[PDB]
Homo-oligomer: A and B are copies of this chain.
Amino acid sequence: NLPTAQEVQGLMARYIELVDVGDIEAIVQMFADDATVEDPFGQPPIHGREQIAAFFRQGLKVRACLTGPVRASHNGCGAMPFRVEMVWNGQPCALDVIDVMRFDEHGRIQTMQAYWSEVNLSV
């Protein structure tokens, strides 16, 4: 069902866990079959699991951690702050991002938006 405020904190923390290990199949399955992702926000969305799996396969070998608590409401929404550490073309970077997610009546991610731009990159 629509996750409660407490369920939203657990699902969102799991999500960062999965991104950190890089288990692409487990990440993809957290999304609804027709979920849409906007990352970075301002960018056109990617729709459906096929496109999301491709987006994630494209980006993972990273380290990701929650840098503060998951903020959650009573209507299936959540927002969380986190940092991603990578090494781009030999140089190590860090990216501070804030993800906002909406869950469906099944506890799956229906919509996701990531807020960040070059001003949040430390290369």
- A residues neighboring B (CB under 8 Å): 5-6, 9, 40-42, 67-69, 71-75, 77-81, 96-98, 100, 115-120
Contacts and interface: CB of A to CB of B under 8 A. Distances in A.
B73 A115 contact: yes
B69 A120 contact: yes
B120 A71 contact: yes
A120 B72 CA distance: 8
A75 B119 contact: no
B68 A115 contact: no
Nearest to A100: B100
Given A77-B41, A77-B42, A98 B71 contact: yes
A74 B9 contact: no
B120 A79 contact: no
**4 interchain residue pairs of minimum CB distance:** A71-B115, A42-B73, A42-B75, A79-B98
Given A72-B117, A98-B98, A100-B100, 16 more contacts: A5-B117, A5-B118, A6-B119, A9-B119, A40-B73, A41-B73, A41-B75, A42-B75, A42-B77, A68-B81, A68-B96, A69-B120, A71-B96, A71-B117, A74-B117, A79-B115
